[PDB]
Assembly symmetry: C4
Homo-oligomer: 138 residues x 4
């Protein structure tokens, strides 16, 4: 049903990484990733880029050196998504202010145009064939 | 009357979360929430995503393990309300830029068109008279 | 020349604060505000919203309790200004992608339609007068 | 092939500053800029504006007093270039909301009307000829 198609995506990326993070990280870092609810919080703060590296990820990379992939992949993937709601909402907003009625007004203006142009077409037909007759007598 | 309609909702979402803040946290966290004014500055801090979690929320979450609702929800509400204040401005910005005129220049263009098409409904109607006379005059 | 109107303004606000700030704070907080360049770098850092409070503002507010006006006002005002520079660039950006090019077709493609109607006006007019030199040459 | 054009401009700016940065800073700040890999992470971190100053910049400018240029300039160039990516997406978004479609809805529609007019045009000519001959046959 539109934007909330992406929202649902965001919740899902969250859930995937929150689980991924609790599996990978819970033992060695329990306060940040000890439970799945814990990591939902951490990823929230990470997603808002708050001390994500200096206070959460650079620490985690010391234990697990390859774990920048978790953190950089999430910033990348979650930002791109958050971006879209912002877009998907900008757009659908423009649409209500404008596009919705713009297409409508001009669909309709062209009905008028077309109908006028239609009338002319007949008159020229009636006239066309008056002249048709008149010439046949001549 | 447009945007300061929301930009006020902002001002009261602030005022509420700032009283709720002081009542709840004033006592363990005096510096941050000790007084209503002290909590505004703190949420102004929080709203800008400045150190909100490592600096404030997680320490508050240490004392009141539920507090994250207060913090996560403030961010959702204030970020959004700010989003709208923004769209509202991006949109009314497009209007004056472009939709103002494209809408109007068009009404104009298609008056002109309509007039011309009327013009010749006329001749054609008149020519249908002349030919209508040739027929009776025979 | 458009947005670069505010771009100039932003720069003015920036510099007025870097001076308003070196005058107020440089005595007591030299590393942050000691020289003008010093304050500028720190106000750039405050503009990027980075450690603006837990880092710089809070410690300055505890010498100079009133000093929140400075950091809150600077963020508010400079965010508003960057907000607009941003919109102005979207507007301007999409004036190019589409709107300029669209109005170029809407116009030229109605030159076409107008011209077409003008030709049919003449034809009906030329016709309208043979049909009435019949009315006279009989 | 579009903004991907611009995304490539960004990846080039990283590369340049990550190398300018590892050459410049790896002796004194090995953790941050020790190796290219290190240096990029650090720059991605600066780009998200995460402690770029209190955490990374100000410490280095302690040691190399002029390095405010490396950091300030990277945040501009780096950030200004990510803006154009954000616009570019914002645009190609509308292209496919609307512009794509309304743009061509109208091409179609003036075919609809050009074609009509063309028709009327035919008939009026046709009528003229009929008047032409009516005219001659009777002179
Ligand atoms: C998409 C945005 C959703 C982000 C909201 C995250 C909510 C996380 C949550 O409900 O956690 C339950 C309790 O964990 P808590 O935050 O108390 O753990 C801190 C370590 N002691
Ligand atoms: C939205 C602008 C795009 C820039 C990159 C986004 C990262 C910063 C995210 C701000 C977090 C605010 C909470 C998101 C609301 C989601 C529901
Ligand atoms: C829209 C959001 C703008 C909110 C600005 C907050 C105003 C703060 C205020 O009026 O009260 C006095 C300042 O308290 P202060 O920040 O000095 O407390 C630090 C702890 N000693
Ligand atoms: C709007 C964006 C422009 C802002 C960039 C400002 C850069 C100013 C600058 O380089 O000043 C240098 C003077 O001192 P410094 O930056 O070294 O301060 C630390 C003292 N230990
Ligand atoms: C453009 C945006 C993408 C930039 C992401 C940069 C990631 C760079 C990378 O993964 O390289 C190797 C990681 O080194 P690491 O961050 O582990 O170094 C810590 C030194 N103690
Ligand atoms: Cl538009
Ligand atoms: Cl027409
Ligand atoms: Na931060
Ligand atoms: Na931030």
């Amino acid at each position: 049903p539109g934007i909330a198609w992406i929202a649902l995506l965001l919740l899902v990326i969250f859930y995937v990484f929150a689980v991924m993070g609790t599996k990978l990280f819970a033992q060695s870092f329990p306060e940040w990733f000890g439970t799945l609810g814990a990591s939902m919080y951490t990823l929230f703060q990470v997603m808002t880029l708050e001390s994500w590296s200096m206070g959460i990820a650079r620490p985690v990379i010391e234990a697990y050196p390859w774990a920048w992939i978790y953190f950089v992949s999430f910033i990348l993937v979650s930002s791109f998504t958050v971006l879209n709601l912002f877009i998907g909402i900008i757009i659908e907003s423009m649409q209500s202010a404008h596009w919705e009625a713009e297409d409508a007004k001009r669909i309709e203006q062209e009905q008028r145009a077309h109908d006028e142009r239609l009338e002319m077409l007949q008159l020229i037909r009636d006239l066309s064939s008056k002249v048709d007759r008149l010439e046949r007598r001549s």
